[PDB]
Structures are given as C-alpha cells and as structure tokens.
C-alpha cells in the first residue's frame, strides 16, 4: 500500500542487500508486506544477520544454516540431518544445526528481557534437544545449559552489532515503536 516508509529506508541502508532480499522473500512467503510491517521487516533482517554472523563463528563446516531458505527446502534439510545423525526431528523449524555438538539451534533476538524471550521460546519448542540461544539489543545473552556454543569474541561481535542497530534506530526516532512492537 505505501510508497516507502522511514523504517524501510533505514532497513535498506542498514543491512546488506542479500539480507534485505531474504527478508522480503521470507515475509512474502508468509503473506507479509515489507512496506507495511516495517518493524517486522527490521526484525527479520536483524534475526537473519545474527544467524549469519553466528554461523560464521566456529570452524568451516560446523553449522548447517536452516534460516534464510524457503520453508519446504528448510524442512528438506532438517529431514536429511535427522536421518543422517539420528537426532530428534523438532516440531518447529530451527535456525542452525551444530555439526560439532550435534544439535539444532534456535536463535532469538529480543527487545525485552532475555529471560522473557527465553521462556517463550523454551515453552514452544518443548524438544529437550534443540539448543536455544537468545540475544538482546542491550548486550545480554542466554543459552541452554549455559552452553553458548561459540567463543566469547564471536558473541561479542553480535552484541556490538545489535547495539549499533539500536542506536541507529533511535537517532531516527524509530527505536521506541520498534521496541513496542515486539
Ligand atoms: C549459500 C548462499 C547464501 C548463504 C548466505 C551466507 C551469507 C554470508 C556471506 C559471507 C561469506 N560474507 C562475509 C563477508 C560479507 C559476506 O557476504 N554472510 C555472513 C555475514 C553476512 C553475509 O552475507 N553465506 C554462507 C555461505 C556463503 C554465503 O554466502 N545462504 C543463504 C541462506 C542459506 C545459506 O547458506 N545461498 C544458498 C542458496 C541460496 C543462496 O543465496
Ligand atoms: C514469517 C515467518 C518467518 C520465519 C519464521 N521462522 C523462524 O524460525 C523465526 N521467526 C522469527 C520471527 C517471527 C515473527 C516476527 C519476527 C521474527 C523475528 F525474530 F525473525 F524477527 N524469529 C525467530 O527467532 C525465528 O527463528 C519470517 C518472517 N515472517
Ligand atoms: Mn527462524
Ligand atoms: Mn530464530
């Protein structure tokens, strides 16, 4: 419906084009319009970039990226990982799979208490096998069994990036509505 919002313009100049394109595709795959739901547009871009920085952490062939693919190809890769190694098939699509630790990973990016969002994610999964790792826009993180998978330096980069995005939204007076939409 709209020709171009302030949030959308910030999203396009804030994230790299591959991420913006994947966010548009993932929303259009679910009936959502990036030009209207601009806060969810930023959050999909944020969640994507965090997943990609995460997978960049570690070795060369450690993580199987699940997020960013279309739904049916993502489940195709999950069925293959499950039949390859033998881990339990989750009821909901995760974001990564750790070949080093042999577990699917759910990545969360919240604008509230990491405890609240961990609890929300932990109750929906209810698969005692999918590892959970939450980041916030304030530098905080929480992970299952206190096992944070990556080194400190990789997590510190993600946290710094989140705080950079937060400041950028606020300078454009977009952070409040972004924090209130979650
Ligand atoms: C594989 C390919 C795309 C990948 C996306 C992901 C992006 C990765 C690129 C890296 C290198 N760096 C670092 C320097 C800048 C840059 O760009 N990062 C990480 C940081 C931001 C970013 O962009 N990776 C990882 C492997 C190579 C690659 O490009 N994706 C998309 C979802 C699944 C997946 O594996 N695919 C697969 C088919 C469709 C497609 O596009
Ligand atoms: C629709 C469906 C998807 C894929 C859903 N699959 C996920 O796996 C998923 N989705 C989300 C999420 C859901 C709703 C609003 C915002 C987000 C967030 F955080 F991205 F910003 N968060 C995750 O952490 C997450 O893993 C994407 C876009 N539209
Ligand atoms: Mn996801
Ligand atoms: Mn996620």
From TrEMBL:
Protein residues bound to Mg(2+) 4: 67, 95, 106
Binding-site residues, Mg(2+) 3: 67
Residues annotated to bind Mn(2+) 1: 95, 106-107
Residues given in the record as Mn(2+) 2 binding sites: 61
Domain of life: Viruses
Record key words, sorted: Eukaryotic host gene expression shutoff by virus, Host gene expression shutoff by virus, Host-virus interaction, Metal-binding
Keyword Membrane: no
GO molecular function: metal ion binding; RNA binding
Ligand binding (Mn(2+) 3): 67, 95
Residues the record lists as binding Mg(2+) 2: 95, 106-107
Binding site for Mn(2+) 4: 95, 106
GO annotation terms (biological process): symbiont-mediated suppression of host gene expression; viral RNA genome replication; viral translational frameshifting
Protein name: Polymerase acidic protein
Lineage: Viruses, Riboviria, Orthornavirae, Negarnaviricota, Polyploviricotina
Residues of the full protein shown: 73 to 195 of 409
């Amino acid at each position: 419906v709209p020709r171009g919002s302030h949030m959308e313009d910030f999203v396009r100049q804030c994230f790299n084009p591959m991420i913006v394109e994947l966010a548009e595709k993932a929303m259009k795959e679910y009936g959502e319009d990036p030009k209207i739901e601009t806060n969810k547009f930023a959050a999909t871009c944020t969640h994507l970039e965090v997943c990609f920085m995460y997978s960049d952490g570690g070795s060369k062939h450690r993580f199987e990226i699940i997020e960013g693919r279309d739904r049916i190809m993502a489940w195709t890769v999950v069925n293959s990982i499950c039949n390859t190694t033998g881990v339990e098939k989750p009821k909901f699509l995760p974001d990564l799979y750790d070949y080093k630790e042999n577990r699917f990973i759910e990545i969360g990016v919240t604008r509230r208490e990491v405890h609240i969002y961990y609890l929300e994610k932990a109750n929906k999964i209810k698969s005692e096998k999918t590892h959970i790792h939450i980041f916030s826009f304030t530098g905080e993180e929480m992970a299952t069994k206190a096992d944070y998978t990556l080194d400190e330096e990789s997590r510190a980069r993600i946290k710094t990036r989140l705080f950079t995005i937060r400041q950028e939204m606020a300078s454009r007076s977009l952070w409040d509505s972004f924090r209130q939409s979650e």
